[PDB]
Each structure stands twice: as C-alpha cells, then as structure tokens.
C-alpha cells in the first residue's frame, strides 16, 4: 500500500532478499519478462529500483501483496520502517 | 548491537566458527535460502561477507541476537575486540 | 503440467534433490549446456529458478515429465503440495 | 514433526549416533545419492547439517519418522530436549 | 558407445567401482588434471557426473574404451542394462 | 533378491561373520580392491554398511548368491528375519 | 555427572580398565555399535576419548551411572581427582 | 588456423578441457586480464565464447598455437572434426 | 594520494587482494551500494577499474586511506612502484 | 603467545602429539565442533593446519595457553625452536 | 624470479606437494585470506592456478622466495625444468 | 623410469607390498608430509593411488629409483610386467 511509496528509499537502500519478493510476485503482479529484467540487476539496490520502476502501474492491490511479502520475508525490517 | 558495525572489518577477518553463529540466527534472523546461500562460499572471510551482505535489513535486536551469539562462541574474541 | 506453474513458489524453495531430475530430464527436454549452467548454480533455490528459467519453452508434454520425474524422486513433497 | 524444527540447533550439536537414524530412513525418506552425501561428511554436526539440509522437502510424516528413529535411538536426549 | 548415452542416467546411478574405471581411461582418454578432478567428488554418483562432464568430447572409440573397461569390471551390471 | 533389500537395517546391524560372506562372494560378485575395502572397517556394521554400498550395481543374480551365502552361514537369522 | 566433565583430560589419560564400563554402559547408555566401535580403538586413551564422543547426546542420568562404575571400578582414581 | 574458424560451434559445444587451452595460450596469445575474464565463466561453453571472443584480434600463427593445443589436449576431437 | 592518481594502470593492472582494501574503506569512504557495486565485478581488473570510478569524489584524505590500506595490505607492490 | 605465530611452519610439520594438545584445549579454547573436525583430518600435519586455521580468533591468553600445553608435552621442541 | 613465470603452465601442472609452499610463503608473500582462498582448491592444478593468480602484485624478492621454497622441496622437479 | 607408466594401472592394482617401497623411497624422492599422507590410506591400491599422486613432480631418476626398489622388493612382479 501507500507505505511502500512512503518508504521508497528505505526499502530500496535496505532489502535483501529480493528472490522471495519476486518468487511471491510472479504471473500475479510481475510478467515474466519484467521477472528477468529485475533478476539482471547486479545488486540489490539496482533490483529494487528496477522492481520499483513497474509500481507506476500497480494499483492498491498489488502494493497490498508486496507489503505482506515483505512483512512475511524480513517482519523486522518492516517493524523497524513503521516505527 | 551497534558492536558489530563497529568492528565489522576485524569480524570478517578474524571469525573462524561461522556454522555456530548460522544454526543460532536460522529461522529467527536468517531465512533458509540465506543459510544455503552464506554456506555455499569457500573461505571464511567469504562466509562472514555473505553474511554481512544481509546485515542492512537487519534492525538492532537482530544485531542484538549475532552479539550474543558470538559471545557465547568465541568469549575471547569479544574481549579481545572491546579492549 | 500446469502443476509446476501452480506450485511455482513452493517447488522453488522445497524441492531438495535437482540432480536427480537434471538426469530424469538430460536429453529429452534439456540441452547439456542448459544443463551445466543449472549445475553451476550455488544453492538448490539458484539452481531451481535456472531450471525454471527454461520453462517458458516448454510445452505440455515436457511440464509432464518434470512431474513425473517429481512423482518418482519426491512422493511426499508432490503428496504434500496437492493437498 | 515440528520438535525437529523447534530443536534444530540442539539436534546438530548433539545427536552422536547418525549411522542408526541413516539406516532407519533409507530407501523411504532418503535417496541412495542423499544417504551417501551425508555418509560422506567428516563429522557428526557436518553430518547432521547435511540431512537437516534435505528436510524442507519433508512433509509431517517423514518428521515424525524421524522423531521416532531418535527415540528409538536416544530417548535420553528426547526427554532431555522436551523438558 | 551409443550405449554410455543411452543409460547415461543408470549409469551415473548405478554405477560402483569408478577407481577401476579412471584407471583403465587413464593417460588415452583422460588427463591427469581431470583424473583429480574426477577423484574429488564426495560420492558415485558426483565422481559419473564429472566424469560424463567430459564426455562431449569424446568420439566413438573413447565411448568404446569406457564400455569395455565397464564388461571387464561389472558385467552383471551392463547384462542387466542390456536386458 | 529383494530379501536383503527388505531386511537392509536388520541385516547390517545383525550379521556377525562378515568374513565368510566376502570369502564367498571373491570374483563373482566382489573385485579384489572392494574385497580388500569392506575387510579394511573397523566394526561388524560398518563392513556391512560398505558392503551394501556396492548393492546398486548388483542385479537378481549377484543378490541371490548373498542370500544363499547367508543361509548357508545363518541359517537362523534368515529364519528370524522371514518371521 | 559434571565430574566427568569437569576432569576429561584426567579421565581420558588416567582410565585403564575400560572393558568393565563398557559392560556397566551397555545396553541402556551405549548401543550395541557404540560398543564395537570403542571396542575397536587401539589404546586405552584413543578408547576414552571414543567413549567421550557420545558423551554430548547423553544427559545428567547417563553422566551419573558413568561416574558410579566408575566408583566401583577405580575408586582410588575418583578419589584423587576430587582430590 | 581457418580450422577454429571453421568449426566454431562444434568446439564451443564440446571442448572439455579449456583450463589446458588457457595455460597454453597464456602470455603469448592472451593477456592476464583476458585470462581471468575466460577464467571468471560459469561453464566450459561460456568459457569456449568468451575465449572465441577474442579470436578477430588474432592472425595465423595465433589460430595455429590453439590449434597445436587442441591436438595435445584432445587429439580424439580433432580428428573427430576432421573426419 | 597523489600515488595512486600516478600509477593508476599499474594499481588497476597489480592489485589482488580487493576485498581487504573494499573492507578497509567501508563506510568511512564507499558507502553499502559503492560496495556492493565494486564487490559484483567479474575480474580484479574489473573491480579496481570500478573502484577508481569513485575516486573523482574523493578529497586527499581518501587516497591517503586508500594508499595506507595498500600499503598494510600490499607492502612489496608499494615499494616496486615506488622504485 | 607470539611464539606459535613465529614458528607456524615448523610448528605444523614437528609436531607430533596433537592428541594431547586437543585434549588441553577442549572446552575453554576449542568447541566441541572443532575439536572432532580437528580429529577428523588424516595425518599430523594436518591436523596442525586445521587446528591453526582457528588461530584468528584467538587472543593472547589461548596462545599462551597452546604454548604451556606444547611445554608440557614436548619440552624438547619448545627448547630446540627456541634455541 | 623469472623462472616462475617462464615454466608458469610446467610449474601449474607439475607441482604436487602445495602445502609446504604455503606455508613457506604464509605470512611474508601471502595473506591469511589469500592462504585459506589457495587452499579451498579441490586439485593441484587448481591451488596452483589460484596461487598464481596472485602473481602480479609480487615483486622479484616474492617470486624468489617461491624458487627458493621450490628448491627446498622438490629439488628434482625444479633441476629437470631448468635443463 | 616410462615402466612405471608403461604399467600404471597394473602397478596399482598388484603391488602388495607398499611399506618397503615408501621405505626406500623416504627422503630421497618422498618428504615426510608425504609419506604419511600415503601411509594413512585403507587398502593397497589406495595407498599406490597416493602414491602416484606425487608421480608428475618426479623426474627419470626418481622413478628409475622406484623401479630400483620394485625389483628388490617384488622380482617376480617386474618379471611377469615385461612378459
């Protein structure tokens, strides 16, 4: 939802495992084509902001599924943003 | 804690009981795809960098968790780094 | 079949023995090359998302043979993921 | 069942008797391949490490095959571990 | 021969004495640096693996030396193939 | 035959002369360099259990001459095991 | 209890009648491999340190009837470490 | 010689043994850098591309030492390719 | 310094051991994804021609830090390219 | 102390009683890991370097520990590297 | 010296005892990272290729002290090269 | 001197008698590292595998020296080989 846009820069300097999101995000928000393009990124900055570059086209919803992915993947960097 | 960024380079240097420290932070700070993946390097050093490439997700309980962990293996080493 | 893009996820983080289906599979659905570069992958999530790499290019009969291949090694996990 | 995973840790560092639990979970929980790679590692914990290694393809019913090889094996460090 | 390819994956499965093997393709069909490289696999199945990594350059007459050397070693194996 | 693959734990932690077994099994089943490997552990199991090692590449022929072996040597264990 | 904790090295290089607790720990403390095997070891000394190996799956129970054969076997030895 | 040139795909897809090739090669046709860039390949086909890569660079007597190499590496392919 | 602004090629071309410099510079000089960007190069060249793309930022004091890291790390390469 | 750092290399190839010196350093220098992967090695030099291996993490008290237990044991080769 | 170089693919594939000159070089040519990176190769050709990777940060005085470690340990190998 | 790679496979699988050859050849052609890597291998063949092992290093005198000993030790061996 809104708080990955209110953490934009946060999210992109401090996650690290980027896989699990792209594996939860697969065929539901992510084509296969933008699955690759991210996958080629050298590092894990460069994959975010490439996983971010398609969030112009997201609605609530999908934001929604990658805020849980997230809370399921690292709950203590997501605990540590919010407070 | 803070401790460990602190003393990062002699950390990555000096650790030799790397497994101990893995089997402490599974499943509460690291999940089994990042065990795989910090057990897959050749050497040491390469271990405790994979490691430490995990590290900016981690809040200051999960930095809490390694310190405790590493004083419960290696006392000496910890003594030794705070003097 | 339809099977190994449903469980996706699941397969990627759970399936534990890929060499065996990289034998199951040489040949028939796999060149050697692609087959080299599954191997080199570090761990067995790597080494999974590779293989699965290469599942756009399927077709039915191939996703067939990944399962049955499945069925054979992993009769729980498969017994497991259908339930 | 879950007491594997809830004791992990304790179970690599202190199960001495692998050959016995190898033997009871041959041929239906473990490959032929899978039984001599973790035959092959130099000791207990390595070896404990590697069969931990196979268990996210498991389902609750190899775990509990697992957990009665143990107590079959070592029911003293079973009911150490549960009290 | 054609006969290695068509059972590649029972031969890497079934497969036993592999010193004997090296030795007799040792100095005509392999080097001594694959030689060591072939020995350093922990388990059977690891060592057929590499040793079938070398196999793409291999002609009819290598194929031929590696089945005769396996009639010589375990003829019950290659009689229950064949049959 | 499939006897000694149904009793494979009750076999490598019950049989006591393995020396015979091996004497019996010289050239037709067993290579010298095997023979010399299983005579070579330290404890009754353990010689069984490298003994057993060598099973994949065993057709119905080579299992039948071990069964018989067995019966021969003990007539009473093979009793116990049908039973 | 602690005490063979407590005095390893001395119990490892002190001990001389072995045979005697290896009947007093059969059977409820030691397997029947367990027995083999320590009874395979060359020297007193490699035969205590093989017998400390399963030391770390045992609990207090299993420490405590260790140190009573040991004070029916050697109470002089028990009396000096306390000692 | 056009002998490489000739037949690029075959060697790409079947030459085994390029650490041989690069050793050879080393100083006299490839620099240290070019040697670590074919050397940093996940796989012998990668490593074939990255090495052929170079080869527009390179006159007669260049393709002639690879040539020479070839034939002391792997005699059996060369002959193979010619035939 | 100034040094290594003078022996640019021959530090791009020389220097082996990157990640103790990569290690001694963090935080103080590169920042987390300066890091991970150097650190995801292929070769050594490649690495240290990504870390002195950095290097128009830096003041005097990070090419001493850089020049004293080579110097404890490197001492021998130090005094040839002085001489 | 300082000792073992300046005579590494003869250190690891005359030393000849490792038994003793891991029996001295179990538990408040060695973990119980370490101790079996240091047993596990195959000859004396080997165990040496494995030994050494965990030497980083070690402060000035475990070497002077390591240097009392070699004084204890070989009094000799204290005094010959000595003198 | 020079003569390193000169036999670099003779010395690569002919040296077979590495240990020894590891650990003549350790601490004056090589650092403890650089050791345990050398070492963690599976085959001699292997630690060799990884110990020259290190060739071009050394100096003559480095390369010399390799000859001399040479020399002392396989006196045959380095007279047959010369001539 | 070429008759031990003329008779490679043969020597490895008939030679019986390997202490006196190590004997023989201690010092002059093997170090001490070295003989006890060879002596700690489980059967004859394995340890004339060893053995061979340090075979690339030597020259024609070191394997004339070898050849010396066989013919000492095992007359009729060398006899039948060159019939």
């Given at each position: 939802l809104?708080?990955?846009d209110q953490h934009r820069a946060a999210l992109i300097a401090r996650?690290?495992?980027?896989?699990?999101?792209?594996?939860?995000l697969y065929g539901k928000v992510?084509?296969?084509?933008?699955?690759?393009?991210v996958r080629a990124e050298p590092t894990?900055?460069?994959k975010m902001r490439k996983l971010?570059?398609?969030?112009?086209?997201?609605?609530?919803?999908?934001?929604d599924l990658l805020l849980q992915?997230?809370?399921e993947s690292?709950?203590?960097l997501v605990?540590?943003?919010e407070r």
């Open positions: 809104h708080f990955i996650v690290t495992n980027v896989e699990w999101l792209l594996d939860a992510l084509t296969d084509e933008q699955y690759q393009a894990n900055p460069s971010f570059s398609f969030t112009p086209a997201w609605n609530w919803t999908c934001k992915a997230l809370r690292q709950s203590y605990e540590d943003l």
